[PDB]
Design a protein that fits this description.
Blueprint: H1 10-26, E1 41-43, E2 49-52, E3 57-59, H2 63-85, H3 95-122, H4 132-151
Helix pairs in contact: 1-4, 2-3, 3-4
Main location: membrane
Protein name: Voltage-dependent calcium channel gamma-1 subunit
Organism: Oryctolagus cuniculus
């Protein structure tokens, strides 16, 4: 009850509940780039590429980011299964891996972010408004709500000569 029902571990776990959906806001919305030739204004994403002058023509062609963000979504889903099952049956050891997959799901958007930047750099201007700063707020959420959940579930630095990690109870 001490590492799983403390409020400092549930403020963090509710914070991941924000970043679980903001990284889902990014992975469906294709709004994190603006092609601006000057009409051929196109808005890039992972899955659909839509050129807007209504003449809303959304289609596909980017593959790297898409493939990389199967792992960012999937890892998060797997992480939840460790985290949803670690609040019951008095097991708290289980949470330790749940904090691993949220760092990974954090860092598998950050490849995605870097992968999407190259596409806009190789292809007329660039501007991101709606879903780069979404995912750069779900990167920084999942990457840092994962490391803090880790240190809020690893026991403590021992602080005394007698104490040891994995110390009884």
């Amino acid at each position: 009850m001490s590492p799983t029902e403390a409020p400092k571990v549930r403020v963090t776990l509710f914070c991941i509940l924000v970043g679980i959906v903001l990284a889902m806001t990014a992975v469906v919305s294709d709004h994190w780039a603006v092609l601006s030739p000057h009409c051929e204004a196109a808005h890039f994403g992972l899955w659909r590429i839509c050129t807007k002058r209504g003449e809303k023509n959304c289609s596909y062609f980017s593959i790297s980011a898409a493939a990389i963000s199967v792992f960012s979504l999937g890892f998060l889903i797997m992480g939840t299964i460790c985290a949803l099952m670690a609040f019951r049956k008095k097991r708290d050891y289980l949470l330790r891996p749940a904090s691993m997959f949220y760092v990974f799901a954090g860092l598998c958007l950050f490849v995605s972010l870097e992968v999407m930047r190259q596409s806009v750099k190789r292809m007329i201007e660039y501007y991101y408004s709606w879903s780069f700063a979404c995912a750069c707020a779900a990167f920084v959420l999942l990457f840092l709500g994962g490391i803090s959940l880790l240190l809020f579930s690893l026991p403590r630095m021992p602080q005394n000569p007698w104490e040891s990690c994995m110390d009884a109870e």
